[PDB]
Design a protein around this ligand. Structure first.
Ligand SMILES: CCCCCCCCCCCCCCCCCC(=O)OCC(COC(=O)CCCCCCCCCCCCCCCCC)OC(=O)CCCCCCCCCCCCCCCCC
Ligand SMILES: CCCCCCCCCCCCCCCCCC(=O)OCC(COC(=O)CCCCCCCCCCCCCCCCC)OC(=O)CCCCCCCCCCCCCCCCC
Ligand code: HEA
Ligand code: HEA
Ligand SMILES: CCCCC/C=C\C/C=C\C/C=C\C/C=C\CCCC(=O)O[C@H](COC(=O)CCCCCCCCCCCCCCCCC)COP(=O)(O)OCCN
Ligand SMILES: CCCCC/C=C\C/C=C\C/C=C\C/C=C\CCCC(=O)O[C@H](COC(=O)CCCCCCCCCCCCCCCCC)COP(=O)(O)OCCN
Ligand SMILES: CCCCC/C=C/C/C=C\CCCCCCCC(=O)O[C@H](COC(=O)CCCCCCCCCCCCCCC)COP(=O)(O)OCC[N+](C)(C)C
Ligand SMILES: CCCCCC/C=C\CCCCCCCCCC(=O)O[C@H](COC(=O)CCCCCCCCCCCCCCC)COP(=O)(O)OC[C@@H](O)CO
Ligand SMILES: CCCCCC/C=C\CCCCCCCCCC(=O)O[C@H](COC(=O)CCCCCCCCCCCCCCC)COP(=O)(O)OC[C@@H](O)CO
Ligand SMILES: CCCCCC/C=C\CCCCCCCCCC(=O)O[C@H](COC(=O)CCCCCCCCCCCCCCC)COP(=O)(O)OC[C@@H](O)CO
Ligand SMILES: CCCCCCCCCCOC1OC(CO)[C@@H](O[C@H]2OC(CO)[C@@H](O)[C@H](O)[C@@H]2O)[C@@H](O)[C@H]1O
Ligand SMILES: C[C@H](CCC(=O)O)[C@H]1CC[C@H]2[C@@H]3[C@H](O)C[C@@H]4C[C@H](O)CC[C@]4(C)[C@H]3C[C@H](O)[C@]12C
Ligand code: CUA
Ligand SMILES: [Cu+2]
Ligand SMILES: [Mg+2]
Ligand code: NA
Ligand SMILES: [Zn+2]
Lengths: 46, 98, 58, 227, 84, 43, 514, 79, 259
């Protein structure tokens, strides 16, 4: 069966807080950055 | 105008469907399909709560029509009382599948 | 025709730990792999198309 | 037009717009009262160490907080509907002017007697004359006679647009294939501004409306000269 | 309503088969008779290039982009009129 | 609610690092695009 | 094992978790788009120098916040996690179909991002009105990709609604009547009913737009005898129920939070709360044309929609006053969640009241398509929904994860956000009354002050969002495991521990019929 | 004669905001009258009122498009 | 071990393959409508058929073969199907609204009349009437099929179900012929728009309904259904009645009143 309990019922690991910081940073950061880059994409097409 | 060839539940039901069907025939409710009827809930006449383990969550509707349900774990051992109305409940553990 | 439901019930209730989508046998595995390959490949192809359509061809 | 740091509505240019100002004052009072009362009660419930956590009976206070709101709604609805129907009253205009929305300008047609029509484009910021308003000035204004009931017919020749003049309390969507009617009546002479009020693409922010209200005599000579 | 028949003392398989063969299918047979009688190709009307018809705001994603999906040369004219 | 002490405490120094990294992950990319806006507009 | 668990899930908790993750990510996308909006309006002139891009940004912002952030979080996240637990059910009725409701969202989101990448994007407004959205004014794939994104999100929500309604109706303990289920469960069921009835109408309407754009139909094209106003009717017939769909689960969570932190065993006037939500749901289907007061409607029709719309204030008032009556006499626990709930009550009331101002067609002629409308919905919808989501998130985070947040940091986050949203939106009332149109990339000079302040407030909220991410990180980084939770006798979802095991209620609860 | 027209008066048959039919009706009436008059041998000046009303209400592009269609034989209305 | 009667489903790949096939079909339609290619669409349609096949195959395995459909599970499936049908009714409602909006206030472009100038409607007394008797009749035969199953009569269940399906196929063939014979097209203004899109979606539903009945036919041949447990057949029948009622409204509205 699957692991259960705190830190085990999630699709990401919280074993190391710094690797976690990196993960959360890429996750939330990629979401927040996308519109800026889409605008940039549209400005550079013409 | 008429004939047969269609199986019946008695001949073809299987798995859990068959279990519920055969148990219902003996008047039993191992899969909790029915709402149990309350006893007087006194110390001498507590509500008997079946369980296959040593604790079961009980939900007490203190008075008829109450919209608030009082929930608590009932453990094996001495009868416990509803935190709200004090009616008694006692766990009666194990079995189900022979 | 004859009723072979009981045979199928035995096959699908066999204690082999297989999930229902694979419990029928080797064919289930093939069909699943075909399905998932077409889905994943088609998705990669769609991303490719998006990349292509994202830019002007004047 | 709006001025710097404006809080409320533009001053009323027509009697209907004045009517709306008084109705908004009435409604806003109610909005202030109810929101302040709610804030107050939140603070009242949160500022005492006294408690009562047992079951509380509801079918009594629910009457009050059901009947009161109902009365307040009728107190808002009455003057609201009076104005709605008042706007709708038959008024019989002295003039009919049509306006067609286009992808990025308005055209006007005064075809009661002569076949007068022209385009009205926003004056680019680079071409504004000293003292003129950025994004609001047009090359050709909608000259109209003051103190007269005018029928405005609105439509479009492409996408949706919306013809608006806040000071007069007007906003009528410009829909292709449809001819929407509204009546205009200015109590004073002057210049009255509005802006396209339905997203129509790239230059939705740049196709304003400017009405120039003058005495009938000047309106007639202007029509003549515009043929 | 109640129809004009009767039974109702017990609606079972026999009753529904009776309705299938005694009412339903005979109705289908009659309508099939009436239809495959009133058919016969109607003389197609003169072509008039009305602007509210034969709409083309974007070519169709098939054929030459000017023919509807179930185009029938006999009765469906193109924006320029009937075909050869 | 009651809970037990942190199994892996995050000191003030560690929190300053997490907070800074977090703020930077949002601000840098957006800042970069916005800074180069004129470079995109006409190019 | 990872793929089996996270890609092939049939578990309500794991699926609710995927939804919360998806919604949080979408919230980041939606926030960035909103900052781009406010940056363009931060000072007079043009920033992007491309108004079609600005329009595409406004459009995407709305779709993302509504379809990818709010609905997924409230219904897919909190709904999947809490509904089965609150009724003692082993899972949802259709646990496998439930997984597809989730998996349809990433593709739907990809289609939305694709529409903004190809051609010049769909700069239509989230209402997607033709002819602007037609194949002449918006030629190319963009609008078609937007329509398809909505189709996928629509199927996801319709199947989800069927699942929730069936689960809530069919899977309660034998002895529990519908009048013994918690208010959140009621809020989700009513929301599901609105979704079931309204989304198919939107699907019909956008399918008609799709055929007008690609199959030469003319449902909304006057040249073929069509009517652009028909689309508006079909859209708003779905649109108004949708705004209530966005707030109902919020009302549900607010009822639990307020009851919980008031130290109460139950909300004041339970049946009145049930009645209020049902009435709001019902009335929400007969008021749609208040979004069309300037299209040229008959005066009697306008008088009817003005009246019907106002009536919704009565049932809504019963809820507001009941929340206050729940606080009355309570042993108030000033937790971060309670703060979000109190902020909700006040901010929602403000927005609701400006909605009542707008209900009056006479005034709406002047306020329609101006910033007064934008101010109205950012209070009821933006603050209302976001404050309910934050309150529920901080309140149930320990249940979902098994860890506690730092209460001080969470109170700081609330404070910043409260200042930010009010500085951003309150000035917009002034801009609206004075005539500034919505959907504008620039404005006449007189409007400069309020737009400047509004854009500054938008940065304050950005600071709150970044802090929120850090706070979540800190919780997961410190690992303070939960021990005890108060009031579990009237909050069943907490009774199986934090986090509850994969399979809960394998042995159902025992509830007497008496 | 009997004229002295300023603009099209209120018409109880078209009392609402959508005036499309009012314009259309008066355009049809003018051309139906004009046809009957030029046909049976009479004066088009009796059709004047309709001409004035439709001219006042109808967008130039509509009148123009309808005129073009009557000429082409594609006018969908009955005249 | 569980002591409730509900079904905990094994982790399944179908929800994902189904979602991806949705992406492929929508992407596919876009590629077809704009970048003149049917490659994505073809893959999408294929994975969609494969997903439905395997997903419903498994539901049969879980019920007929494993016995997971206890009365509580079957009760939920009943609610699920009723709710599904309700959402379909609302979908069609949008098309009827579109039809009535256009026909009740014909615009000047149509000649200010309905049907529009230049449109020559089909005679509702000809094939449209035949189609009506065909669906009404299949409603009678499927009811006979249902009673035969409940009464344990295999042969007559199969006979009645076969007749129902043949009638559904007859309707489809007749409709296809009507489509080809119609002098008006989908591009003929709002008349052709409302006609083809509404009857077109209905036709799709008739095909889906026929397919569902065919699935039941084969499951019956294989003895899956018992005289008392046969939800798949019941769902097929409810769906079939829905399709029948939608036709009656289309016939009355579009074909008869709209002519
Ligand atoms: C897009 C994803 C970014 C990629 C970054 C990941 C890098 C992996 C390297 C890889 C390095 C391997 C490390 C192994 C283990 C840990 C990392 C993990 O396994 O990797 C992946 C895991 C974990 O996710 C993470 O990685 C970190 C996330 C941390 C989240 C903290 C959330 C706190 C809030 C609380 C939420 C509720 C839970 C609380 C309660 C607790 C639960 C009960 O995700 C998932 O498998 C499921 C998530 C699915 C969907 C979410 C949003 C997607 C939107 C897509 C639409 C796109 C449209 C086109 C858009 C195209 C873009 C232009
Ligand atoms: C940041 C914005 C700065 C604005 C400064 C104004 C400049 C004054 C020049 C000083 C110049 C004075 C001379 C001007 C007179 C012209 C009168 C008129 O023709 O114009 C009429 C206009 C103008 O409005 C006014 O007649 C002034 C009202 C001002 C209300 C200010 C509330 C401030 C709260 C603090 C921050 C906001 C966020 C709180 C949220 C409040 C909820 C709405 O009316 C409106 O439609 C605006 C508001 C509309 C809708 C909101 C309804 C709910 C209010 C809730 C009250 C909560 C109280 C608790 C107390 C609140 C506790 C939080
Ligand atoms: C959470 C989402 C949500 C909710 C709940 C509401 C609730 C309401 N909305 Fe709002 N609304 C939107 C989201 C929402 N709205 C959106 C997104 C738009 C614009 C969409 C777009 O164009 O893009 C919009 C647009 C909008 C319009 C159109 C404006 C225009 O475009 O010109 C109107 C018209 O009447 C309106 C009215 C109302 C009313 C009367 C309520 C009522 O339900 C509010 C009732 C609540 C209260 C009144 C407060 C609590 C009550 C009391 C304390 C009791 C006492 C009160 C009284 C006696 C008055 N809304
Ligand atoms: C749910 C709906 C929602 C939300 C939250 C928001 C949030 C915001 N919106 Fe809104 N907006 C709309 C819906 C919403 N908006 C709609 C429907 C339109 C109309 C579009 C059109 O005209 O077509 C619009 C239009 C619109 C305009 C008008 C554009 C124009 O007319 O030109 C403006 C202008 O300032 C604006 C600003 C903002 C800002 C600054 C925020 C926010 O930054 C305010 C602060 C809120 C947040 C930062 C959200 C944080 C939430 C999360 C990150 C989730 C966290 C997740 C978990 C805890 C699980 N929005
Ligand atoms: C281009 C068209 C194509 C589309 C066709 C659509 C569906 C049709 C497909 C199959 C239908 C036909 C047969 C079905 C297959 C096997 C049938 C054999 C069973 C049988 O013989 O059934 C008999 C019924 O008669 C029967 O078929 C009788 C069946 C015939 C009924 C219709 C014929 C009409 C004849 C003229 C009468 C019309 C007059 C109208 C009067 C007014 C009505 C109210 C009853 O007998 P039994 O002894 O009680 O039964 C013992 C077990 N079978
Ligand atoms: C035989 C009776 C049964 C009808 C269906 C059978 C075959 C057609 C293929 C798919 C139909 C499925 C749904 C209907 C969608 C559009 C209307 C189709 C109805 C139809 O088939 O109409 C035909 C038009 O074909 C056209 O454009 C068809 C063009 C085909 C492209 C399909 C476009 C796909 C658009 C689908 C959008 C899907 C959105 C669904 C949303 C679901 C909810 C989320 C009519 O032909 P015609 O030549 O104009 O006139 C006849 C003159 N002799
Ligand atoms: C826009 C329009 C809306 C505006 C205003 C509406 C506000 C209403 C204002 C006042 C309401 C008056 C209700 C009167 C109830 C008396 C309170 C009381 O005292 O509460 C109980 C009554 O139960 C009960 O009604 C249950 C407890 C109290 C009942 C009512 C509680 C809620 C009151 C309102 C809460 C604040 C929210 C107001 C919203 C505006 C006490 O019970 P007993 O004395 O039997 O037992 C005590 C034992 N003895 C016998 C030894 C004394
Ligand atoms: C091209 C343009 C847009 C395209 C979008 C297409 C989107 C997805 C396409 C692929 C989906 C097909 C896959 C088959 C889905 C079967 C779902 C099903 O059959 O779900 C069932 C529940 O719904 C029930 O009953 C009753 C409900 C039956 C639901 C059938 C699903 C149809 C999906 C389309 C819905 C359209 C919405 C209609 C409104 C306009 C079974 O529930 P499970 O949890 O599985 O099992 C529970 C176990 O106890 C069973 O033993
Ligand atoms: C049933 C509930 C109780 C009834 C109470 C009343 C509320 C709705 C009534 C439903 C039927 C009303 C039909 C009345 C026809 C009169 C109006 C009419 O004639 O409207 C027409 C369109 O109606 C149309 O499509 C009307 C088409 C539908 C619009 C109403 C929306 C409801 C549809 C969804 C309902 C879901 C229920 C599920 C069904 C099983 C055309 O447009 P007008 O604006 O008229 O243009 C004329 C102008 O030129 C003059 O200025
Ligand atoms: C060229 C043709 C391709 C066209 C695409 C669509 C193709 C086919 C759609 C037809 C759907 C077939 C569904 C077959 C379902 C088989 C599984 C089944 O029927 O499963 C049954 C449960 O019902 C269940 O899940 C009920 C499940 C309900 C599913 C019905 C949903 C219809 C799907 C519509 C999708 C499109 C939406 C419209 C688009 C606008 C199993 O229980 P029982 O029958 O009681 O058996 C148990 C007994 O044996 C015990 O003794
Ligand atoms: C709405 C959300 C946005 C919030 C505002 C963003 C807050 C500030 C972000 C800082 O980010 C940056 O700062 C720069 C300037 O300080 C840049 O450097 C740039 O500028 C330089 C010097 O001025 C150079 O050293 C480099 O080449 C360079 O590209 C730029 O890349 C960027 O990452
Ligand atoms: C009768 C029903 C349920 C009562 C119960 O079974 O417990 C209750 C619940 C909510 C009540 C309604 C709400 O309290 C709101 C209204 C309050 C007014 O005092 C009377 C009518 C009013 C519309 C109420 C009528 C009726 O008493 C309702 C509808
Ligand atoms: Cu024209 Cu906006
Ligand atoms: Cu609304
Ligand atoms: Mg508008
Ligand atoms: Na700007
Ligand atoms: Zn009790």
């Amino acid at each position: 069966h699957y692991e259960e309990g705190p830190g085990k019922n999630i699709p990401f690991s919280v074993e190391n807080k710094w690797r976690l910081l990196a993960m959360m940073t890429l996750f939330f950061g990629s979401g927040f950055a996308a519109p800026f880059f889409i605008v940039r994409h549209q400005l550079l097409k013409k | 105008a008429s004939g047969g060839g269609v199986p019946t539940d008695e001949e073809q039901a299987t798995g859990l469907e068959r279990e519920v069907m055969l148990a219902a025939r003996k008047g039993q409710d191992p899969y909790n399909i029915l709402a149990p009827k309350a006893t007087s809930g006194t110390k001498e006449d507590p509500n008997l709560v079946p369980s296959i383990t040593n604790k079961r969550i009980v939900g007490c509707i203190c008075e008829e029509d109450n919209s608030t349900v009082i929930w608590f774990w009932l453990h094996k051992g001495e009868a416990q009382r509803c935190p709200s109305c004090g009616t008694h409940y006692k766990l009666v553990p194990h079995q189900l599948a022979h | 025709f004859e009723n072979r439901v009981a045979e199928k019930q035995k096959l699908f209730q066999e204690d082999n730990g297989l999930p229902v989508h694979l419990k029928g046998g080797a064919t289930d595995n093939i069909l699943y792999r075909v399905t998932m390959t077409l889905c994943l490949g088609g998705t990669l192809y769609s991303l490719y198309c998006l990349g292509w359509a994202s830019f002007p061809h004047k | 037009m709006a001025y710097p740091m404006q809080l409320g509505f533009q001053d009323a240019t027509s009697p209907i717009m004045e009517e709306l100002l008084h109705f908004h004052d009435h409604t806003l009072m109610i909005v202030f009262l109810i929101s302040s009362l709610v804030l107050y009660i939140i603070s009242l419930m949160l500022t005492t160490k006294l408690t009562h956590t047992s079951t509380m009976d509801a079918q009594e206070v629910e009457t009050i907080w059901t009947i009161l709101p109902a009365i307040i709604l009728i107190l808002i609805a009455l003057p609201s509907l009076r104005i709605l129907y008042m706007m709708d009253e038959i008024n019989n205009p002295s003039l009919t002017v049509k306006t067609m929305g286009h992808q990025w300008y308005w055209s006007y047609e005064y075809t009661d007697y002569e076949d007068l029509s022209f385009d009205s484009y926003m004056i680019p910021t680079s071409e504004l004359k000293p003292g003129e308003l950025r994004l609001l000035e047009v090359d050709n204004r909608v000259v109209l006679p003051m103190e007269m009931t005018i029928r405005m017919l609105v439509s479009s020749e492409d996408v949706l647009h919306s013809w608006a003049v806040p000071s007069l309390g007007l906003k009528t969507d410009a829909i292709p294939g449809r001819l929407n009617q509204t009546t205009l009546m200015s109590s004073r002479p002057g210049l009255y501004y509005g802006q396209c009020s339905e997203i129509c693409g790239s230059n939705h922010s740049f196709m304003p409306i400017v009405l120039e209200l003058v005495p009938l005599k000047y309106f007639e000579k202007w029509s003549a000269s515009m043929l | 309503a109640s129809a004009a028949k009767g039974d109702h003392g017990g609606t079972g398989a026999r009753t529904w088969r009776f309705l299938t063969f005694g009412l339903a299918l005979p109705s289908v047979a009659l309508c099939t008779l009436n239809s495959w009688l009133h058919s016969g190709h109607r003389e197609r009307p003169a072509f008039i290039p009305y602007h509210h018809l034969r709409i083309r705001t974007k070519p169709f994603s098939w054929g030459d982009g000017n023919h509807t999906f179930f185009h029938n040369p006999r009765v469906n004219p193109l924006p320029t009129g009937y075909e050869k | 609610i009651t809970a037990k002490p942190a199994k892996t405490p995050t000191s003030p120094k560690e929190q300053a690092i997490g907070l800074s990294v977090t703020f930077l992950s949002f601000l840098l990319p957006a800042g970069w695009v916005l800074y180069h806006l004129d470079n995109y507009k006409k190019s | 094992m990872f793929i089996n668990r996270w890609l092939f899930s049939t578990n309500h908790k794991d699926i609710g978790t995927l939804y919360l993750l998806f919604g949080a990510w979408a919230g980041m996308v939606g926030t960035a788009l909103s900052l781009l909006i406010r940056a363009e309006l931060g000072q007079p002139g043009t920033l992007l120098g491309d108004d079609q891009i600005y329009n595409v940004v406004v459009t995407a912002h709305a779709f993302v916040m509504i379809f990818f952030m709010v609905m997924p979080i409230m219904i897919g996240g909190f709904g999947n996690w809490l509904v089965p637990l609150m009724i003692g059910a082993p899972d949802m009725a259709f646990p496998r179909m439930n997984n597809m409701s989730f998996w349809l969202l990433p593709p739907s989101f990809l289609l939305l991002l694709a529409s903004s990448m190809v051609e010049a994007g769909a700069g239509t407004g989230w209402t997607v009105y033709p002819p602007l959205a037609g194949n002449l004014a918006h030629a190319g794939a963009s609008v078609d990709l937007t329509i398809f994104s909505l189709h996928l999100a629509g199927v996801s929500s319709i199947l989800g609604a069927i699942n929730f309604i069936t689960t809530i109706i069919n899977m309660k303990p034998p002895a529990m009547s519908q009048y013994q289920t918690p208010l959140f469960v009621w809020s989700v069921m009513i929301t599901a009913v609105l979704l079931l009835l309204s989304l198919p109408v939107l699907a019909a309407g956008i399918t008609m737009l799709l055929t007008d754009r690609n199959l030469n139909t003319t449902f909304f094209d006057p040249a073929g005898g069509g009517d652009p106003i028909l689309y508006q009717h079909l859209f708003w017939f779905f649109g108004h129920p949708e705004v209530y769909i966005l707030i109902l689960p919020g009302f549900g969570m607010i009822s639990h939070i307020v009851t919980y932190y008031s130290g109460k065993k139950e909300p004041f006037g339970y049946m009145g709360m049930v009645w209020a939500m049902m009435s709001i749901g019902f009335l929400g289907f007969i008021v749609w044309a208040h979004h069309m007061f300037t299209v040229g409607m008959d005066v009697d029709t306008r008088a009817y929609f003005t009246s019907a719309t106002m009536i919704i204030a009565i049932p809504t008032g019963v809820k507001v006053f009941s929340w206050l009556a729940t606080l009355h006499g309570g042993n108030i626990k000033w937790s971060p969640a309670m703060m979000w709930a109190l902020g909700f009550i006040f901010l929602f009331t403000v927005g609701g009241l400006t909605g009542i101002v707008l209900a009056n067609s006479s005034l709406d002629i002047v306020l329609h398509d101006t910033y007064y409308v934008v101010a109205h919905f950012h209070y009821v919808l933006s603050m209302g929904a976001v404050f309910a989501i934050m309150g529920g998130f901080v309140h149930w985070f320990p249940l979902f994860s098994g860890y506690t947040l730092n209460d001080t940091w969470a109170k700081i986050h609330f404070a910043i956000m409260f200042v930010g949203v009010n500085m951003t939106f309150f000035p917009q009332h002034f801009l609206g009354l004075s005539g500034m149109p919505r959907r504008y990339s620039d404005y006449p000079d007189a409007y400069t002050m309020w737009n400047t302040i509004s854009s500054m407030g938008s940065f304050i909220s950005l600071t709150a969002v970044m802090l929120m991410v850090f706070i979540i990180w800190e919780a997961f980084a410190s690992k303070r495991e939960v021990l005890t939770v108060d009031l579990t006798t009237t909050n069943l979802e907490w009774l199986n521990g934090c986090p509850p095991p994969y399979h809960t209620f394998e042995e159902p609860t025992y509830v007497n019929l008496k | 004669k009997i004229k002295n027209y300023q603009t099209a008066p209120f018409d109880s048959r078209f009392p609402n905001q959508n005036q499309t039919r009012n314009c259309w009706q008066n355009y049809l009436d003018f051309h139906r009258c004009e046809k009957a008059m030029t046909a049976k041998g009479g004066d088009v000046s009796v059709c004047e009122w309709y001409r004035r009303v439709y001219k006042s209400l109808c967008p130039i592009s509509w009148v123009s498009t309808w005129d073009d269609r009557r000429a082409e034989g594609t006018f969908p209305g009955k005249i | 071990h569980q002591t409730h009667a509900y079904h905990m489903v094994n982790p399944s790949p179908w929800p994902l393959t189904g979602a991806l096939s949705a992406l492929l079909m929508t992407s596919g339609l876009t590629m077809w409508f704009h970048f003149n290619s049917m490659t994505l669409l073809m893959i999408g349609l294929t994975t969609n058929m494969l997903t439905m096949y395997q997903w419903w195959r498994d539901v049969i395995r879980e019920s007929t073969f494993q016995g997971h459909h206890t009365p509580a599970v079957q009760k939920g499936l009943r609610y699920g199907m009723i709710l599904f049908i309700i959402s379909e009714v609302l979908f069609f409602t949008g098309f009827f609204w579109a039809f009535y909006h256009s026909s009740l206030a014909p615009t000047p472009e149509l000649g200010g009349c309905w049907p529009p100038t230049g449109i020559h409607p089909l005679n509702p007394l000809e094939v449209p009437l035949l189609n009506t008797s065909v669906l009404l009749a299949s409603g009678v035969s499927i009811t006979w099929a249902h009673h035969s199953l409940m009464e344990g009569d295999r042969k007559h269940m199969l006979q009645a179900l076969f007749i129902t399906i043949t009638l559904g196929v007859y309707f489809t063939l007749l409709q296809a012929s009507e489509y080809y014979e119609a002098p008006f097209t989908i591009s003929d203004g709002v008349y052709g728009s409302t006609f083809f899109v509404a009857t077109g979606f209905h036709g799709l539903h008739v095909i889906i309904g026929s397919t569902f009945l065919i699935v039941c036919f084969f499951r019956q041949l294989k003895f899956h259904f018992t005289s008392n447990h046969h939800f798949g057949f019941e769902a097929a029948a409810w769906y079939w009645h829905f399709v029948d009622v939608v036709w009656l409204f289309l016939y009355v509205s579009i074909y008869w009143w709209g002519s």
